[PDB]
Design an enzyme around this catalytic site. Structure first.
Site, short mmCIF file in Angstrom:
data_model
loop_
_atom_site.label_atom_id
_atom_site.label_comp_id
_atom_site.label_asym_id
_atom_site.label_seq_id
_atom_site.Cartn_x
_atom_site.Cartn_y
_atom_site.Cartn_z
CG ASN A 1 33.89 -18.97 -38.37
OD1 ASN A 1 35.06 -18.67 -38.70
ND2 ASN A 1 33.67 -20.09 -39.06
CG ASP B 1 30.59 -23.11 -32.21
OD1 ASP B 1 31.85 -23.60 -32.40
OD2 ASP B 1 29.76 -23.06 -32.92
CD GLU C 1 33.92 -25.81 -31.78
OE1 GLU C 1 34.52 -25.25 -32.56
OE2 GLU C 1 33.12 -26.45 -32.31
C1 LIG Z 1 29.60 -24.37 -34.03
C2 LIG Z 1 28.85 -23.70 -35.00
O1 LIG Z 1 29.78 -23.52 -35.30
C3 LIG Z 1 28.25 -24.71 -35.79
C4 LIG Z 1 27.68 -24.66 -37.31
O2 LIG Z 1 26.55 -22.70 -36.87
C5 LIG Z 1 26.92 -25.37 -34.66
O3 LIG Z 1 26.53 -26.21 -36.06
C6 LIG Z 1 24.58 -26.08 -35.63
O4 LIG Z 1 24.80 -25.82 -37.71
C7 LIG Z 1 25.13 -27.03 -38.25
C8 LIG Z 1 24.32 -26.51 -39.61
O5 LIG Z 1 23.01 -26.73 -39.60
C9 LIG Z 1 22.59 -25.55 -40.69
O6 LIG Z 1 23.39 -26.33 -41.93
C10 LIG Z 1 22.69 -27.64 -42.63
C11 LIG Z 1 23.59 -28.40 -43.14
O7 LIG Z 1 23.20 -27.79 -44.42
C12 LIG Z 1 21.62 -27.59 -42.40
O8 LIG Z 1 20.75 -28.53 -42.38
C13 LIG Z 1 20.57 -26.86 -40.62
O9 LIG Z 1 19.29 -26.75 -40.53
C14 LIG Z 1 21.78 -25.34 -40.65
O10 LIG Z 1 20.94 -24.81 -39.37
C15 LIG Z 1 23.79 -27.78 -37.56
O11 LIG Z 1 24.33 -29.10 -38.61
C16 LIG Z 1 23.79 -30.23 -38.96
C17 LIG Z 1 23.98 -30.38 -40.24
C18 LIG Z 1 23.10 -32.13 -40.19
C19 LIG Z 1 23.46 -33.11 -41.02
C20 LIG Z 1 22.26 -34.19 -41.29
C21 LIG Z 1 22.70 -35.23 -42.43
C22 LIG Z 1 22.47 -36.19 -42.45
C23 LIG Z 1 20.24 -36.17 -43.18
N1 LIG Z 1 19.72 -37.91 -43.31
C24 LIG Z 1 24.48 -28.37 -36.28
O12 LIG Z 1 23.87 -29.24 -35.92
C25 LIG Z 1 24.47 -27.37 -35.53
O13 LIG Z 1 24.77 -27.65 -34.13
C26 LIG Z 1 27.99 -25.82 -33.55
O14 LIG Z 1 26.64 -26.73 -32.90
C27 LIG Z 1 28.58 -24.78 -32.64
O15 LIG Z 1 28.68 -25.33 -31.47
CA LIG Z 2 35.90 -16.99 -40.67
#
Ligand SMILES: *[C@@H]1[C@@H](O)[C@H](CO)[C@@H](O[C@H]2O[C@H](CO[C@H]3O[C@H](CO)[C@@H](O)[C@H](O)[C@H]3O)[C@@H](OCCCCCCCCN)[C@H](O)[C@H]2O)[C@H](O)[C@H]1O
Ligand SMILES: [Ca+2]
Ligand SMILES: [Ca+2]
Ligand SMILES: [Ca+2]
Length: 512
Positions: free
Chosen positions: A119, A210, A245
């Site tokens: 994706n 994913d 997924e």
């Molecule tokens: C399937 C995937 O589709 C999905 C997305 O790639 C996977 O999730 C992962 O990525 C998200 C997003 O991570 C990116 O963006 C965040 C948000 O801006 C950044 O913080 C990251 O550094 C960057 O890599 C990630 O989401 C984390 C969100 C955090 C929210 C915190 C809020 C509270 C703060 N005090 C996921 O952890 C990561 O695994 C998914 O895992 C796949 O299965």
């Molecule tokens: Ca898309």
């Protein structure tokens, strides 16, 4: 003193698509070189724990397929932002370490699927950085053609984007660091064919895909894309296996199955609000059996070769043990039996089998804590967002739990052995439920061509159930297997057509 019904019964290793899968979040599993990051050599070092290659002896878990989270170069600890689709992230090892992992898995009868992120790419993937430069020069007919790049005004209103030059943007549902591919693009399809072949040629058995929910968009038919991709990969490897997924409603999962993809994760039955854990707490056996039958069969209408993918929780959800452990270890054991003895391919999340919990319910990093092979010698692995301090599992580590016949881990092990003795369970379809005039009891018939089993779960926390099995149910019924959580020493039996099923227990009935 009742004989164990599975004693001396021959187990056979799976040689087809039907597997008990094990999801490894690579960062958090096993560090072989002291940087506090899990790596491929660490996985290799623990392969005999996962499967020793002999289904009839040993004290291995017994899983027969691994799904690796992303292993390719990325700046993040999770690596779903892929910076290079043709190599291994240096922290995880090299392509030589990867080849070793494949060889060693296959020697033990373990299949391997890779997290192939179609994706979206990393914003630092060179294909994308070139697109960005070209868009800033009003060139849209080069590398921009790989990505979902349009004027800002093109996007559906609720679509998040990355801002590019000259009023252009790229679709980016998940993050500004995760620009999305244009799945309709000729160039993208060419690239995906190359990436698929690259990994398939290295012995990979298939992929986890994913974010299938975001294949479909204003101009993209995700079913058409996935069919194109799946059939491409079947040409490369005829028995390639994929699981998608598709985190969405049933009708969208039905739709996507017309792609011919083997599997999609059964979200409905996962997490504390999902069918299985909800109904283990509510002692709703009859409801659960009905729901499993109806869902498995509905999905089979869309794909007659659908392999359902049941799971309690994954790396994007709170650990199942956060809900189940406080209800008693026998609830955790029953949960395992229920999701794993449904048709299809269940997915155990690494550490689930020893009851690893999340230290908080809201931070994704807390879903990916450090695997504990030995609670006397706790791991030293860093997980960005939660540090490197290890939580102790209530039941101890792998080494502790293997020794204790009554452990969660040994319950998983026994489930797997029963599956290896009874191929119909994974491969069949549910042809009916069996009522026992008791909402706590969930029973169904699974049939695989010439062969039928009756699986009975007693969801009652406190009450044994004395059930009558007639010839109309199973002709010349015998007890094929039991799973009784209160004690590994306790077994039941079928005698004059009556069988006592203890609290939170499972039995399997088969014709003599
Ligand atoms: C399937 C995937 O589709 C999905 C997305 O790639 C996977 O999730 C992962 O990525 C998200 C997003 O991570 C990116 O963006 C965040 C948000 O801006 C950044 O913080 C990251 O550094 C960057 O890599 C990630 O989401 C984390 C969100 C955090 C929210 C915190 C809020 C509270 C703060 N005090 C996921 O952890 C990561 O695994 C998914 O895992 C796949 O299965
Ligand atoms: Ca898309
Ligand atoms: Ca390491
Ligand atoms: Ca073994």
């Amino acid at each position: 003193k009742v004989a164990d019904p599975i004693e001396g019964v021959k187990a056979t290793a799976s040689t087809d698509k039907y597997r008990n899968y094990y999801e490894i979040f690579v960062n958090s599993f096993c560090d072989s070189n002291g940087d506090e990051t899990g790596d491929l050599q660490g996985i290799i070092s623990q392969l005999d724990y996962l499967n020793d290659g002999d289904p009839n002896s040993g004290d291995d878990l017994g899983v027969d397929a691994i799904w690796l989270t992303p292993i390719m170069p990325s700046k993040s600890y999770h690596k779903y932002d892929v910076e290079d689709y043709y190599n291994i992230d240096p922290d995880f090892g090299t392509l030589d370490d990867f080849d070793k992992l494949i060889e060693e898995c296959h020697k033990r009868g373990i299949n391997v699927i890779l997290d192939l992120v179609l994706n979206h790419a990393s914003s630092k993937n060179p294909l994308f950085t070139k697109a960005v430069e070209e868009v800033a020069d009003n060139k849209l007919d080069g590398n921009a053609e790989y990505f979902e790049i349009h004027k800002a005004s093109y996007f559906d209103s609720n679509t998040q984007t990355i801002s590019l030059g000259n009023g252009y943007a790229c679709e980016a549902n998940f993050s500004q660091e995760m620009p999305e591919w244009n799945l309709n693009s000729k160039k993208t399809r060419e690239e995906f064919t190359k990436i698929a072949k690259f990994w398939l040629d290295r012995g990979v058995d298939g992929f986890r895909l994913d974010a299938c929910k975001y294949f479909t968009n204003k101009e993209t038919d995700g079913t058409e894309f996935l069919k194109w991709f799946y059939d491409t990969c079947k040409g490369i490897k005829e028995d390639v296996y994929m699981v998608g997924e598709n985190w969405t409603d049933d009708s969208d999962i039905q739709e996507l199955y017309k792609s011919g993809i083997d599997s999609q994760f059964a979200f409905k039955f996962s997490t504390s609000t999902g069918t299985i854990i909800s109904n283990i707490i509510s002692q709703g056996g009859m409801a659960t059996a009905k729901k499993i039958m109806n869902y498995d069969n509905k999905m089979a209408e869309s794909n007659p070769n659908a392999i359902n993918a049941m799971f309690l929780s994954n790396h994007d959800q709170v650990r199942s043990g956060n809900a189940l452990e406080s209800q008693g270890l026998s609830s955790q054991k029953l949960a395992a039996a229920v999701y794993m003895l449904a048709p299809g391919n269940p997915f155990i999340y690494y550490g689930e089998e020893i009851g690893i919990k999340a230290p908080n319910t809201t931070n994704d990093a807390a879903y990916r804590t450090q695997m504990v092979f030995d609670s006397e010698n706790l791991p030293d692995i860093y997980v960005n967002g939660i540090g490197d301090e290890p939580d102790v599992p209530t039941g101890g580590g792998v080494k502790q739990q293997l020794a204790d016949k009554d452990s969660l881990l040994n319950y998983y092990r026994r489930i797997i052995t029963i599956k290896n003795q009874n191929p119909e369970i994974a491969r069949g379809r549910i042809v009916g439920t069996q009522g026992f005039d008791d909402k706590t009891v969930g029973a169904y018939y699974v049939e695989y061509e010439d062969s039928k089993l009756l699986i009975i779960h007693n969801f009652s926390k406190n009450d044994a159930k004395e059930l009558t099995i007639t010839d109309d149910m199973i002709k010349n019924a015998t007890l094929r297997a039991d799973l009784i959580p209160e004690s590994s020493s306790k077994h039941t039996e079928l005698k004059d057509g009556k069988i006592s099923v203890p609290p939170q227990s499972t039995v399997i009935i088969k014709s003599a």
